[PDB]
Design an enzyme around this catalytic site. Sequence first.
Site, mmCIF file in Angstrom:
data_model
loop_
_atom_site.group_PDB
_atom_site.id
_atom_site.type_symbol
_atom_site.label_atom_id
_atom_site.label_comp_id
_atom_site.label_asym_id
_atom_site.label_seq_id
_atom_site.Cartn_x
_atom_site.Cartn_y
_atom_site.Cartn_z
ATOM 1 C CB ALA A 48 1.380 19.578 -4.886
ATOM 2 C CE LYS A 60 -3.305 11.012 -1.926
ATOM 3 N NZ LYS A 60 -3.658 12.708 -0.541
ATOM 4 C CB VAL A 101 -5.708 19.094 -1.583
ATOM 5 C CG1 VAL A 101 -6.219 18.403 -2.871
ATOM 6 C CG2 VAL A 101 -7.245 19.025 -1.344
ATOM 7 C CD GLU A 102 -1.531 14.265 1.590
ATOM 8 O OE1 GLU A 102 -0.991 14.704 2.287
ATOM 9 O OE2 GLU A 102 -2.418 13.511 1.649
ATOM 10 C CG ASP A 103 -1.791 15.018 -6.671
ATOM 11 O OD1 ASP A 103 -1.317 16.456 -7.732
ATOM 12 O OD2 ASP A 103 -2.352 13.459 -7.637
#
Lengths: 229, 229, 229, 229, 229, 229, 65, 70, 65, 70, 67, 67
Positions: free
Chosen positions: F98, F74, F115-117
């Site tokens: 992150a 992302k 998990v990346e956001d």
Amino acid sequence: XFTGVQGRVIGYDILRSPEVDKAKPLFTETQWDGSELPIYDAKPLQDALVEYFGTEQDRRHYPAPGSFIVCANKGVTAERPKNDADMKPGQGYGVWSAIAISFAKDPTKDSSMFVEDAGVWETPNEDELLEYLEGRRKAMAKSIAECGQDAHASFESSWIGFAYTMMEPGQIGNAITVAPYVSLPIDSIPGGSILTPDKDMEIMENLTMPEWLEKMGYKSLSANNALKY
Amino acid sequence: XFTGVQGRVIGYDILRSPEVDKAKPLFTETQWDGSELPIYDAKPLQDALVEYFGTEQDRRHYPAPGSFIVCANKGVTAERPKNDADMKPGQGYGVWSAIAISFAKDPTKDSSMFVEDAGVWETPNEDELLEYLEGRRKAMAKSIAECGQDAHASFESSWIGFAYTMMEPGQIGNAITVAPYVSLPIDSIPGGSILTPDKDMEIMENLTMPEWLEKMGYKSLSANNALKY
Amino acid sequence: XFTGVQGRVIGYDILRSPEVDKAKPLFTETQWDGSELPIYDAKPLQDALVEYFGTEQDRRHYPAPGSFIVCANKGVTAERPKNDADMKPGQGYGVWSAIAISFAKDPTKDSSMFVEDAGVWETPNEDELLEYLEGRRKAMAKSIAECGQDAHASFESSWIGFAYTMMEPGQIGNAITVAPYVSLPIDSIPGGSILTPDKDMEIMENLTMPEWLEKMGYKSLSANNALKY
Amino acid sequence: XFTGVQGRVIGYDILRSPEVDKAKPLFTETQWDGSELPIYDAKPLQDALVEYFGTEQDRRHYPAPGSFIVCANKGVTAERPKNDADMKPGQGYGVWSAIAISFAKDPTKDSSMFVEDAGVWETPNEDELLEYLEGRRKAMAKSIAECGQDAHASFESSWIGFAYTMMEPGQIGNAITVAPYVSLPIDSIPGGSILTPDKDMEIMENLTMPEWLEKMGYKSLSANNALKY
Amino acid sequence: XFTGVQGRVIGYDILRSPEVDKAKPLFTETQWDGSELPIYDAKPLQDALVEYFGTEQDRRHYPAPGSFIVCANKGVTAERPKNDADMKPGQGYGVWSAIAISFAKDPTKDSSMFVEDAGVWETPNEDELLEYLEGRRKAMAKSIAECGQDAHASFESSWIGFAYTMMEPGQIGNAITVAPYVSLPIDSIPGGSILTPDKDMEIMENLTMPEWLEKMGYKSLSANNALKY
Amino acid sequence: XFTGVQGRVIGYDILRSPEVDKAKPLFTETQWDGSELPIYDAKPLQDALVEYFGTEQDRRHYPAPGSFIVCANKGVTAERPKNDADMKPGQGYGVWSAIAISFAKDPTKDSSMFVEDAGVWETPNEDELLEYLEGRRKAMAKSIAECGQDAHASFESSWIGFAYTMMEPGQIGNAITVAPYVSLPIDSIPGGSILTPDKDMEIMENLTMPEWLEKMGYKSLSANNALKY
Amino acid sequence: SELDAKLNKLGVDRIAISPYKQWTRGYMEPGNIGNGYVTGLKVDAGVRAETKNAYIGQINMTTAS
Amino acid sequence: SELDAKLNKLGVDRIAISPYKQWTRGYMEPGNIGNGYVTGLKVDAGVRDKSDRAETKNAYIGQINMTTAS
Amino acid sequence: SELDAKLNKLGVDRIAISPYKQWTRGYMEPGNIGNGYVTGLKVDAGVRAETKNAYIGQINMTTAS
Amino acid sequence: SELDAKLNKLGVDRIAISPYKQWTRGYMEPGNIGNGYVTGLKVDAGVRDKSDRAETKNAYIGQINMTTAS
Amino acid sequence: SELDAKLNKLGVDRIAISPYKQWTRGYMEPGNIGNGYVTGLKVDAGVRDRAETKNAYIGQINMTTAS
Amino acid sequence: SELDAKLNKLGVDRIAISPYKQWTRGYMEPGNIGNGYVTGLKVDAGVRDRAETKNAYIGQINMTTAS
């Protein structure tokens, strides 16, 4: 053995020594088809294979330690005794052997043939042997000739050669013929690469034996007729 | 050799000639296990292989020019002289050879065996030879029978056959046995494809030799017993 | 054969029986290079191969039914007659054979050699045979020694052994030598897997023959010298 | 995105249309390295790809029904309404898109770059659009130029082109860019063969787009500038 | 998206649920070619895939932990708020999605198409949604119909289905469509083997979904219409 | 996203930086199973990947020019304007992102999750951002925790980290997360060889990041905390 | 056939396909697809053995015993 | 050469590359890239003395495991 | 060409052959012989994008950016 | 089936076998035997509650790395 | 072992794995994983009135001579 | 490691070797030896008035998203 559709002869088809078209027959022989099949001395070809595999000292591209080189071969050994110049039958004064390759006229259908034979000799004047050999060629030659009919296959040229050594004293002597069947290594092919398998082949198919040597930085060994057989 | 777990016999297992279950033994022989092992003439099988490889003229699916067909074989050659009907020991009046295949009862464990043998003959009335041969079968046969015990392996049927030719005049004659080990080509398999390797096999495993011929548009050659041996 | 760069000897290189460094020579022989080449009895190695392939009864990792195990071998057979203790030349009282393996000093360049030979024997006191054999070793031994010079290759240790059997009565007897060339199966390698080809090898290269047996749950058979040859 | 070490651009590197060296820049732009990078219209290349894949009617070497052609692409769609010539923001009078390829100076280290961009247009006189586009090129162009510095990579020529269509009435219009990544089929390579993988490539690398067409018996379609964009 | 020449749809082409020919259309639609393309509810197919992959509890043949299953999909999520039944635009009362598969008339040339779409819904009586959906089908349907002409490709039957869930309270709700592209595992194929790749396929192509279950010892889950969507 | 059965994380599973067991949590969180899942700063891992790929200047083992590195990622970009410190909504003062990796308790069944956001930030005091971030972790953390239940999968430790940059002036700023999926090259594996594929892996699995550097003769770059994020 | 099925679980297949047009070739020659072999029986004689009846002509024989 | 082209459409290639440094190896040994072979001609003769030397002379096929094909 | 030669010693080839009759297929799809790819340029528009001029029709697109 | 036969002569097969125990895996992942693919249809919908659950319902494609193709 | 490491850089490996349950098979037979071989030593003798089948079994094998 | 051993009996390996000098390449690209993959973690940020090229380089790459 034979050399067929998958074949290439070091010296004739790949790595060609100049000598080969420079050559000129010893004679010709009618085949059942009718074409005069020229027969030539096999000096160039033999010599080629030396340049490529190399000699015990001048080691070049030889079969790997421990490999399984399937070959067409025949061998022969005997003594010519301690003095007792009395012959317990498997003994002789001299030993000899020969190989003959006859390139097929059409590789799409018929297969090129090797004919190799050998033996021992019971006289002791070199001339007599020499003589037997040069005779023998014609036997092998006419033999190559009627040989085709079973297969209905006619050749285009047979290349034939010999090795002999005359013994005396209780020496044992050996004579052999061998056609090996190998696969070439990468660095024998200048600018070849493990990723370019068929291009690698066409490079060897387009260099003459001279050229190959030069790019590889290998001094000749056939050069000025210096190899005995 | 033998024909084992990787095996299929052209004629029995793939490409079956009808003849095979139509057949009926020449006799039976007790084995060490105890089953009566039926022995049958090997005419159907032999004939099959011809239909598939083809003859020098009627060329069908033969080994490629120059290939390395590993085989189980034995051969024999001798003359029956210019007239001098005096025998320098490696000469004879007739030459003969035979092959025998005994399909294993359980291919998961034991291997099917080929037994092939050959020689020369010193009499000159055909009946005497013929006779020796039909006798010989039983030798080979009982031989197949006690043969198993080392392996503790019992067979299910042995198929045995012969080829001979009677010479005279200073002709040289040769007799051979050969079991070849080949891999089949795509177009011998109707509706086979290089992408369907195992299906390709089951097509040959399901056609009878007749059927195969018809789909391929090949005239028979075994047909009405027309092949000599 | 030879065993070269691709080689590993069951018993010496993989699956080592303890015996091997426990061993001690029968003697030594000067080579043309000059090193004293120790010669040892080949008992451990021979015995190893049994543990791995297994015996007809105690079947362990044997060559597949119907496979094509290329081998280096020689064989010999003869009778010692019905009574007629008169010798039609291919007959004898006893038969013998031997194999010899000499590990190459440097596997990057020279190849390890097998030398195997055999024959028949015309006396009938066991001592005379026994004796011939222990003598023979030294022949083979000195033979291994001058053997190198053509190749300019020197060894590091030759391991030599024998099998004989003395006959009488119209028995036929056979003696053979065989070096096989196999590829190992997965379950002979404890914790091996078809996805770990080279690790699979280093597991066999790191277990001693004992260890291997234990993890596999196979009782020994060499154990307390119980195999005759 | 990019086209790197594994790359070849249909039209520039393989299947070359003559046009390419016949071409001449629209202008040049300084790069951070300092070389004047020429920018050329991408007409030849675009046209090439058509000749190769073919058109819906003149179907030639197109991606297989159902395949997974990974591509670099962007797309855009909007309406220019039923009449209500009032703009609910994702609508416009015309739609446009472009692609740009800049061949790397040294393919051993840096990668060739594609830059593709697109959008919609809110005026309705064609000249204004046309104009925006020819301007845009220079943006993309200077963009290609400072683009290298992160990578410390300088190009050698950027080829840039456009497709637009002006709408009216409640039509919806779409514009796209797409670089596909394919593998060539055998019969697009005259005298290619599934056994000659790399030679197959050098045949496409040595024919000019003309030549290719002739050997294949395909009529041109770029020919006399007949493809609109 | 598409499913082309390399395709097989779990349920229609392999592992067929009986239901499929038992089915009967909802209606038909003229195509530009002219054939009445029947449209059927996609219940059987959907249900099939469940039987095969299994459910979180009843785990059967699901994609491996960590694999890269390329898929055709679209998703949608929104809330229907804490109470504040005031709509900050990406919120809705209900969420819905659909997939549609239309098998190509001729798989040698045209590709079967998937059409999948989705959204959110701003009313809160179930009937209104239900209704929108059953309407929608015909849109998708006529859409499948004129869809072909670009490709000049006509279908043979489109199978279409839906999943929705009506929300309330500050729940967030998600709806998706997904066509996965997988390769089948060995043990899902009764009597399949890693050595029989294409036969392995024809086994799945010849069992009906029932049959498959029985041989595998898997209880049904579609069975008596028990799966909601 | 995930990293499953085929996975290995540079830094944790292969090439381990010492730091990792030296570490100590920021805190713990109950999972639905019940185990307290420790959460740790992702500094070591991040830093590892730098040592291996290298930096634009200190180029080490980076993805090949033009390759297709499938990644989980992302990204985010926005300006913080020329002065006009008025916000046309896709603009912000700072940008942040992150990634979080949670190693699965049992890799035979469940898959490790990434998990990346990411996003943008509308305040301009660094403390406020910093603060938001350290808070955010716990969200992601508790998120990792209830995350398992669908899968009925419980983790063993989640490693989480951030990168942000605060802008001002009409700069545009970008922040990204990326998990790449690569295959290692031969020379990154000391004493690896293209013939030893799985051994090659166990060498990387047994060296600590330090050790690796030393054998490779590469100076550290994580070393004394010198990499900003 | 059924045997292959019980055989395959041991790892043995009996496929033996050659990639040549028309020609058969031999067990172990490179490029053969499969890991099995197909055999047959040939015995012929003449007073020229090989070339009669069933042709295995022009072949490089390798003996296995 | 031209022949290969007419040969390839039958399925036959004549590539024979070995993956070893310097060494040649033989037809059929595993790992060889290609499905052809390369052959040559060797005939040589030599000596030993009472109580290898052919092979090792002139062209070396030394230290090889020979397999006869006839 | 010359580049391939300097490229190959790194281990990179740029062969990209598909085993299908007539059809091209994409980088990475199984069964492709070679380890390279071939690309091209297509930009087209219409007021139905894909199917015009150069056909990449009926394709499963995978985006790479 | 019959189609495969007409399809194979073009060079296309539709085999898609995975080498894993029990697990299916995806088109193009290395180690798959064959050059085809197998597809299916899944549409499902579900719920969560304020401050995965589609996928995991009915037919499981759970814990998967999805790659979009359009 | 160390040798393999110096050997591998020449292109030579010595892996020799067979894909059969329990059975060994021979150098060069198709399907073998690896490019090496494993050898051993067998010498045995027997009369009857049977070499192969004794002690170490290489029974029921198709032998190919290499010299 | 031990895991691989329990993993391999399922048919899964985790080898991931690339045949290029120096360069890494990606999961699924043809020519890779092995059937596994190796992953890592990268998060970096930068403005200019450039994410990728900072700190850990994944530069000049064709990205393919998996979610």
